[PDB]
Amino acid sequence: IPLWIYSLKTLEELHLTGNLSAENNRYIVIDGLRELKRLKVLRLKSNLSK
Amino acid sequence: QVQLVESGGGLVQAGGSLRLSCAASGFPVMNAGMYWYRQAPGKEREWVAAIESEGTSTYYADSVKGRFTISRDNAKNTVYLQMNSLKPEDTAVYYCNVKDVGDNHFPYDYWGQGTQVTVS
Amino acid sequence: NLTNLERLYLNRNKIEKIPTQLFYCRKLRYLDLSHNNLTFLPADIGLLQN
């Protein structure tokens, strides 16, 4: 995934359709989602457990 | 240049209070999101503390929620994290992290060297 | 307190509410509040006829 995804401060819709479940972490890969204050739509598709 | 360096690492038996710190170079800390991650032997990096830019709102994981205090000081251009009698099971190597500062070059996330705090 | 505003721009901010007293400046022509976390457009806009 791009490492600059969280630098898009004007992003409105985010569509993740991968597998965010990494090794024994609470989805640390998307821990930068708090940066996007303009986010309106989120479409995670990664077979979430928690 | 952009780099993170932290201090305050020291083995402390349960019953005291430790004060952490950091040091950000090349960018203001006010207009940037700072993060605290913990590293353990045989365990991956776990998020601990996050302070949101443009509004100064603190975010804590349920593992350590309601137990620490994190603040940003622009006078020293650093972030202070203070613990409250951290448990022996909380011993970890804390990592500083700030990602996507106003400057946008190839390194998008910056980490510190890492300080080991021991509790027994 | 301001009275003679004729062109106001407040794009790209984090503003939820438009204050009622904002329309005391009745000479606005190019009022613009876009890309903001607004919720409602106040009803006193009719007081700003220009």
Largest sheet of chain B: 6 strands, antiparallel
Number of strands of chain B: 10
The most extensive contact between chains is: A-B, 15 and 19 residues
Per CATH, the superfamily of chain B is Immunoglobulins
- Approximate strand percentage of chain A: 5-15%
What's the order of the H and E elements of chain A? EE
Sketch the major β-sheet of chain A. 2 strands, parallel
The number of helical elements of chain B comes to 0
Sum up the overall morphology of chain B in one term.
globular
Oligomer: part of a larger assembly
CATH fold title of chain B:
Immunoglobulin-like
Cα(first) to Cα(last) distance of chain B is 38 Å
Briefly note the structural class of the backbone of chain A: little secondary structure
The value of Rg of chain A in angstroms is 11 Å
Strand content of chain B: 35-45%
Large-scale geometry of chain A: globular
Strand order of the largest sheet of chain A: 1-2
Q: Count of helices of chain A?
A: 0
Taking all Cα atoms into account, the compactness measure Rg of chain B is 14 Å
- Quick one: CATH class of chain B? Mainly Beta
Q: Which structural class should the secondary elements of chain B be placed in?
A: mainly beta
PDB class: membrane protein
Keywords: LRRC8 family, Volume-Regulated Anion Channel, leucine-rich repeat, sybody, cryo-EM, membrane protein
Entry title: Structure of homomeric LRRC8A Volume-Regulated Anion Channel in complex with synthetic nanobody Sb3
Chains A, C: Volume-regulated anion channel subunit LRRC8A
Verbal overview:
- This is part of a larger assembly, with 2 copies of chain A (50 residues) and 1 copy of chain B (120 residues).
- Chain A is mostly loops and 50 residues long.
- Chain A has strands at 13-14, 41-42.
- Chain A is built from no helices and 2 strands.
- Chain A has a two-stranded parallel ribbon with strand order 1-2.
- Chain A starts with 12 loop residues before the first strand and ends in an 8-residue tail after the last strand.
- Chain B has 120 residues and is mainly beta.
- Chain B has one domain (3-119): Sandwich (Immunoglobulin-like), CATH 2.60.40.10.
- Chain B has strands at 3-4, 24-25, 34-40, 43-52, 57-60, 69-73, 78-82, 92-99, 109-111, 115-117.
- In chain B, a hairpin with a 2-residue loop joins strand 3 (34-40) and strand 4 (43-52).
- At the A-B interface, loops of A face strand 4 of B.
